[PDB]
């Protein structure tokens, strides 16, 4: 069954496009054009962290919004302190390329992982001596790109061999397995209830996932190129995605389609990492042309520019209370913006 | 009291900074070698008391566009090959013409005719390199023709920031080529070229 199934799948996808067109009676910009914008919001470099050797690929804030975990490629996870510009712990490895890093929602465990397929969990208690791998989660067959802690007991690992899986620590095996994708998976994000989560895939298809379902709820095939950036809007309902085709298609789960496309004419480069603020109005995106252009959520205007770095940015986190934004670029510096 | 905890924080900061100084010493003594044709094969060895951590890739899903991009900090990409040859030419062109591989000089190895490349008969053969004895001149012409094909794909918009090095199949030539890449990168630092 391939020909009639192909025709039926094409007809049903056209029915989905027609339902999205019927829901799309008007665009979001034409109905939110009446909103008076805040205006040009500039920022200023406040701190400059100097403790790195290779490029910085990933960072992650804490729930206390005071500490952050930096992932370099020399093999050293360095815990930085924000408001006292100092360091807390330096976590070494036997490998080099640390493609992901995560922080616990209670502040007790730090994850890592790269091409070596060893998702190590480092405790933040240090009873007997220094930091140490508590348990390892080596079960994938490709690589590891992004992982985020749900709680202190389990963590989902977006892998590169198309298999996404939730991993309990003490079992050392797959709790559940999500293989709905076709291509590579770069990044994910977490809703504030820590139950629903999405997955940014490299086939222009964002998939809504869930733990209790064991199966994908929704699929957003809106982009044109590969996706390297994805993040939730802070209400837990909408989410923004970043691709390499110089667009930022704003999606929403309950609206079944896209909302706004950030296609600027003077930008012919990709988008690295996106995040929202505490309100969600400041679209904080990481571009490829050596700056982080601040975009408006509802008016699509460049409210500012963050060009304090000298190389390509790769990660952009926002604190849980809207205190600071530290962008980690490939210049081995951590410029904190306020 | 802020004073005691701040002094303990300063002491821990100085300890981690001396650890980072030792890491900076051992990392500037560290040279990396990506090898392509656990999850990674870290092959550690030293040549003339110089560290060369060679890294090979094994069981990986080979959509390479998302995991090559974490290799701009490497000193030399070793690209050994032996249809497979045309896909190797296309992969070498994709590595050479990437946006973030402009400062990575690629060391190229060869190994291993008339059906895959019918344009072989219209080639002018230089006698600049002395061949090894006991070799067929037709096979020698084909080998240097594959070298010249990789060199013309290299010099087709090479941008001057990185250069290829075709070779034929030891480790001493790898050491000489790493010295070559380090010296050319430092001459581009001092802008003498």
């Amino acid at each position: 069954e391939l020909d009639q199934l192909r025709q039926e799948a094409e007809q049903l996808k056209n029915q989905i496009r027609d339902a999205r067109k019927a829901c799309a009676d008007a665009t979001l910009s034409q109905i939110t054009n009446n909103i008076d914008p805040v205006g040009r919001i500039q920022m200023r470099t406040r701190r400059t962290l100097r403790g790195h050797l290779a490029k910085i690929y990933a960072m992650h804030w804490g729930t206390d919004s005071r500490l952050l975990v930096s992932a370099s490629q020399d093999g050293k996870l360095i815990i930085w302190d924000s408001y006292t510009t100092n360091k807390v712990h330096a976590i070494p490895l036997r490998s080099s390329w640390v493609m992901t890093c995560a922080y616990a929602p209670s502040g007790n465990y730090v994850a890592c992982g790269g091409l070596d397929n060893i998702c190590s969990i480092y405790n933040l208690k240090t009873r007997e001596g220094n930091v140490r791998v508590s348990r390892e989660l080596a079960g994938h067959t490709g690589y590891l790109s992004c992982c985020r802690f749900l709680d202190d007991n389990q963590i989902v690992t977006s892998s590169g061999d198309t298999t996404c899986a939730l991993w309990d620590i003490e079992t050392g095996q797959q709790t559940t397995t999500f293989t709905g994708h076709t291509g590579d998976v770069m990044s994910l994000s977490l809703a504030p209830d820590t139950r629903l989560f999405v997955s940014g895939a490299c086939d222009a298809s964002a998939k809504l996932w869930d733990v209790r379902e064991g199966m994908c709820r929704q699929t957003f095939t809106g982009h044109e190129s590969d996706i390297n950036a994805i993040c939730f809007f802070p209400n837990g309902n909408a989410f923004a995605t970043g691709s390499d085709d110089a667009t930022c298609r704003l999606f929403d789960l309950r609206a079944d389609q896209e909302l706004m496309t950030y296609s600027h004419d003077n930008i012919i480069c990709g988008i690295t990492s996106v995040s929202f603020s505490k309100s969600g109005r400041l679209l904080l995106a990481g571009y490829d042309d050596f700056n982080c252009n601040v975009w408006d959520a509802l008016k699509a205007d460049r409210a500012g520019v963050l060009a304090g770095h000298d190389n390509r940015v790769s990660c952009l986190g926002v604190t849980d209370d809207g205190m600071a934004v530290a962008t980690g670029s490939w210049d081995s510096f951590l410029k904190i913006w306020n | 009291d802020q004073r005691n905890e701040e002094k303990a924080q300063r002491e821990a900061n100085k300890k981690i900074e001396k650890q980072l100084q030792k890491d900076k010493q051992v990392y500037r003594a560290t040279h990396r070698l990506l090898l392509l044709g656990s999850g990674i094969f870290e092959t550690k060895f030293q040549v003339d008391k110089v560290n060369f951590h060679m890294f090979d890739v094994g069981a990986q899903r080979d959509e390479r566009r998302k995991w090559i991009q974490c290799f701009n900090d490497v000193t030399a990409i070793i690209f050994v090959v032996a249809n497979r040859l045309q896909a190797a030419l296309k992969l070498f062109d994709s590595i050479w013409n990437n946006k973030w591989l402009r400062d990575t000089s690629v060391i190229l190895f060869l190994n291993k005719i008339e059906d895959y490349f019918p344009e072989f008969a219209r080639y002018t053969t230089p006698e600049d390199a002395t061949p090894e004895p006991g070799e067929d001149p037709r096979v020698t012409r084909a080998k240097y023709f594959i070298r010249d094909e990789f060199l013309r794909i290299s010099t087709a918009s090479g941008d001057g920031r990185h250069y290829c090095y075709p070779h034929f199949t030891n480790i001493r030539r790898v050491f000489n080529d790493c010295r070559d890449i380090i010296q050319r990168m430092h001459l581009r630092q001092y802008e003498l070229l």
Partner: nanobody, 126 residues
Framework: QVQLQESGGGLVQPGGSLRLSCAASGFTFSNYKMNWVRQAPGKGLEWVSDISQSGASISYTGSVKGRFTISRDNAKNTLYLQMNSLKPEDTAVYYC?????????????????????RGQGTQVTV
């Protein structure tokens, strides 16, 4: 979603020319360097030819140099491949593929581990 449709197919005699139009939509055609990838029975995927965004950078596989002709239509967003001087060993599934990133030249569509931006493919039996 990048929908990709092709044209042609069926049993053809060795030596007769046949057009290969790549019916593509849903994306900006003038911002990507699309290409062709064939898959022979008993052989892995291999690159055929390409054309750039402007139309100047045109290359070919070393075995089919000059015998094939690639052309793109910028206005009507399709890719027109023309087969000439056919050979019975050159038959394969001609996938209309697209390189993933805009305004660049690197392409990683030769990998057979389900690169999900290739076409649905039409068998042209020579």
């Amino acid at each position: 979603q990048v929908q990709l449709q092709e044209s042609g197919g069926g049993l053809v005699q060795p030596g007769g020319s046949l057009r290969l139009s790549c019916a593509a939509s849903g994306f900006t055609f003038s911002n990507y360097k699309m290409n062709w990838v064939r898959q022979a029975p008993g052989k892995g995927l291999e690159w055929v030819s390409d054309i750039s965004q402007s139309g100047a950078s045109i290359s070919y596989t070393g075995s089919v140099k000059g015998r094939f002709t690639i052309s793109r239509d910028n206005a009507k967003n399709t890719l027109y491949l023309q087969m000439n001087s056919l050979k019975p060993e050159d038959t394969a599934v001609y996938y209309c593929a697209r390189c993933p990133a805009p305004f660049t030249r690197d392409c990683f569509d030769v990998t057979s581990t389900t690169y999900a931006y290739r076409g649905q493919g039409t068998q042209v039996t020579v």
